[PDB]
Symmetry: D2
Subunit: 153 residues, 4 copies
């Protein structure tokens, strides 16, 4: 099975972590994907020791190296800095890239993209919108990049 | 052959910041004998009247991070700029040298170890990461900090 | 019946609108408060005409003038600029102030408060944290400011 | 007697920004004959060794906004700074004169009319709001913009 790293800032808010993440994980898993979600995958880190921050950093770094694609939740103004670092790692490692934003605000300096142009550096010049999801219900669309990627095209 | 530093900042988005904040930093770096690639300057030959300009700038910045020796990332703001963060993650994944700059005294973090989100330090060592972390322009040329030591 | 203006950024994201806001609305309503939620209250605006943005701004401004207190959701780094404007209006108009933040990141310019000191300018020097709620489940606590407000204590 | 501008900005948080970005804006406003109240400077005499300093600064800033004639809000960033936004909201509710400054060319808005969150413009008129919206330091001096009309009763 293809491995998706689900990069989001939803683990920082108790309510967001509980209500927002599980539905996205389920949509992904219904496509046959193995989902790596960093907040859940790090729940067994000894939050006691002071080095936990460095341990989590390295664990997330390895999960990106070892995933097949990244599903980056890029809601908010601006998108979360941890998601962006992990997205930049994904781009540089030639992983598949999928972006999610159901926030309807536009926040960018260019007409082409709704966000800072670097978020799109790992996507094609034409047809990048096919990798850009704007609702949870769209994740399972057979006409979007995630489905096509699983099934060849 | 000079070492090449990609100077990643959000300062080009503001007319005033572009004019007054970047030159002092570029000059401090050039003083060390570094070749500075500053993405806003490096893309001023682009035709910003064509809609494809955004993709061309993305690919330029992507290529310049690939081709640099290290990144000097201005990570001021709450949060740090998302373009800088993508470029920083690229630099980490490609084993470039990493240097961080924050002269913002606000602390904005999940953890007690680091003043920012822990991912920004994933490419720095567990011990002694502070030596790569600059908190004022006047500190950039310090011979006790990681950028000078890396050059030599 | 006391009127709370529930100020939040959650109407900008489809998922956050449907999943995060109703639970907070219900917790406030269970205390016996009349909740004014600006995204719901503006859904009968004619959004085809360009001036809709001005109409929403004035309707929001009036709701804050006419409420008794503000319940400001100040998750995020930084908190939402619209919420902050409205918080600022509430402070100047001597409305009662209640803050909600279940995001565990600390992001502040000072040792005393968990956020930018100006968010607390309308709270008392002593006991400001009694107005600062950290989980949805805490909203109904008999020991916090909303309840004291409703029982005159 | 000079009109009083409260110059609200996040530039005091960064050593370089405080040193290089604020004085040119202060000078621009003073060139119009305005008295400028810049909160990072006005609070330099607070005793920052006592933990209550944050409460004293908050109250001092709150009082300055009550006592000013208008606010000049530097609303650069994505998003604009939350302390600036609180003070802007105070100024709107207190019927102060409102002037916004953004030389950030990123557009970051919920709507097609305004370049930023619509609530920042709630204190400005429906028509001609852009006359109060400055996009460069050099434009502060413009006799066609709101600061100058304000000072000449036009
Ligand atoms: N405290 C934390 N726990 C787990 N992942 C974290 C984290 N802080 C940052 N990250 C990583 O960066 C992203 C959110 O900032 C997603 C996650 O992989
Ligand atoms: N319009 C632009 N011009 C140049 N670089 C840009 C840019 N938008 C984003 N970037 C890249 O991403 C970072 C700033 O967000 C630094 C820069 O290299
Ligand atoms: N459509 C809208 N645009 C901006 N702000 C809005 C809004 N509807 C409601 N608001 C109020 O303004 C703040 C959101 O930015 C909090 C919210 O209560
Ligand atoms: N010394 C200081 N430290 C932090 N915030 C300060 C400050 N002086 C003033 N403030 C207020 O903090 C707010 C941050 O934008 C606005 C500003 O008026």
């Amino acid at each position: 099975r293809k491995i998706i790293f689900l990069s989001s800032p939803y683990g920082f808010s108790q309510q967001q972590k509980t209500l927002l993440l599980p539905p996205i994980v389920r949509a992904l898993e219904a496509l046959g994907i193995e989902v790596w979600e960093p907040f859940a995958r790090n729940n067994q880190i000894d939050f006691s020791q002071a080095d936990w921050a460095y341990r989590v950093a390295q664990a997330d770094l390895q999960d990106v190296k070892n995933c097949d694609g990244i599903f980056a939740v890029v809601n908010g103004t601006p998108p979360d800095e941890g998601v962006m670092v992990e997205l930049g790692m994904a781009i540089a490692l030639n992983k598949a890239i999928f972006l999610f934003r159901d926030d309807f605000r536009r926040c960018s300096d260019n007409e082409r993209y709704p966000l800072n142009l670097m978020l799109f550096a790992g996507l094609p010049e034409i047809g990048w919108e096919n990798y850009y999801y704007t609702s949870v219900d769209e994740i399972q669309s057979h006409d979007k990049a995630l489905y096509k990627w699983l099934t060849g095209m």
